[model samples]
Target: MRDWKTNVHVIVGPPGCGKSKWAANFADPETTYWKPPRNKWWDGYHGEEVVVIDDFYGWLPWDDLLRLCDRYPLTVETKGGTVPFLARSILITSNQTPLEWYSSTAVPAVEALYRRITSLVFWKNEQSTEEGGQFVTLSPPC
Candidate 1:
């Protein structure tokens, strides 16, 4: 089966967790994983507008996220502005909970952006469980 990269994956884990390491492994070997600093994540991504934002921990510039959401399909340009991202994909990893996102920072902005993306991904905590000793789990349906 083919992997789906055209979605917003909210990878979460405690600090000292290997969230960034995991993101790198899942990336298309052909494509590079972009890690933008908390402040510059929006502008620093080197890939297409649909690029991946790694190690964010929900620290993305909320204003930029809102603007991109308005564009629906936008481009991520280089520092030199020489290249346009075209229609790429975006993947984000955050340790912050959805409630925190809605309250502390983006309010509805990031949440709106989250809705526009193809899907959401939640990493299983070591303590995650099911009703029975033998149970099932879910990943991206694709």
Candidate 2:
């Protein structure tokens, strides 16, 4: 089996795009797994590969997200925004392209977060044809 013991993978997309389903396939039921309403209280707790936080929105526990990245393979969902810190890869699903989802005060924090993403995948519909498709982009290690 592929070594699921990797780092974070942020899967993003619109509703019904199967982002959760996609991430779930990577989850190992035998390992530590968690979903939210997340809290900072979970900090320092470690999980195995295939940890997932689905349908993630902005303003979730920041430190906990970072903690997950530090431990094992993590798959989380986001509408759009800077990903969590030290993320290994990013997968976004959108009608439009991914944007910096942050407030003015959060800009620097957001920038630092996206800086960690070494791989990016965009799942979107063809703007001209309106057909669904996906593409991948890989960045050099940080």
Candidate 3:
């Protein structure tokens, strides 16, 4: 039931908690996993089954990220011309939650982004059990 009509899935957590690793899990080698920091990576995009955008920490490129989340077609500038396509399901990993990210600017696009996402997951930090094993769990931001 976590899946919604929205194409964007957001995972929020601090460093060392495997936030990026969790996003990488969706890639599994076959899919395309692009980091937002590398804007040039978009050129390689080809509408894969699943795409993961990792580490949107302090700043988010509003233009690209907005278009990628919405139903509107995004024109990715490739080597030669451009590829006009709507991205498939996207998994986004962030060190800051939507609120924290929004506080950076609190712009309308950020507001739109918060609404665009469906699965707002909070991945808590991993803790060591008394038996010496490590354990981790995902829970709501609430």
Candidate 4:
């Protein structure tokens, strides 16, 4: 069987975690950035080079998004969802840490999804005294 896994990177954090802005502002002249409409047919995204799905929430065709990841390098900026295992790249933003996803109250449907990711990164915001801001990475839990 062909290993469908590609270069997957899950950037998960709370709201206003800077990741969404980072992914949204990424510029590559050669790569087309596609923002597919939510809960709608994404026929317009065909043949796109780079696709970024920001604030991915509400009732939408998540399965379709999974299919898209299989074919392209998808940058997903979601509040929360089942991270697409086939994703070559992933960026998730939530109000809580990734560990919260493992709680018993979490949707049982995504248990398998949580295991697909090899690492979880937590970004901590540092207080700014001058014009510069800072962020630090937390250790990943086993």
Which one is best on lDDT?
Answer: 3
> What C-alpha RMSD separates each model from the true structure?
6.9, 9.1, 7.4, 8.9
Model 2: weakest 10-residue lDDT segment is 126-135
Q: lDDT tens digits, residues 1-142, model 4?
A: 1134532234555676675665555445335344554544443433334445555452344344334434443433334432322323444434454344344453444333444443444445621112111133132221
- TM-score order, best first, reads 3, 1, 2, 4
TM-score of 4: 0.46
- lDDT tens digits, residue span 1-142, model 1: 1122345455555665776766666656456546455554335444443455665644655665544434344454445563334334555666753345445443644445545444445546542312211223121221
Which has the greatest TM-score?
3
Clashes of 1: 4
Better of 1 and 3 by TM-score: 3
- Candidate 3, 1-142: lDDT as tens digits: 1222436777777777877777667655566546446554466666564677777754545656666676754566666777655446778777775556554354654456656665666664452222111132222211
Pairwise TM-score winner, candidates 2 and 3:
3
Report the error of model 4 at residue 115, Å: 3.1
* lDDT at 114, model 2: 45
lDDT of 2 by residue, 43-134 (tens): 32233334455555544444444434443433334444223323222232232232333343754464444444333434455112111223
Against the reference, the lDDT scores of all candidates come to 0.48, 0.40, 0.58, 0.41
Better model by lDDT, 1 or 3? 3
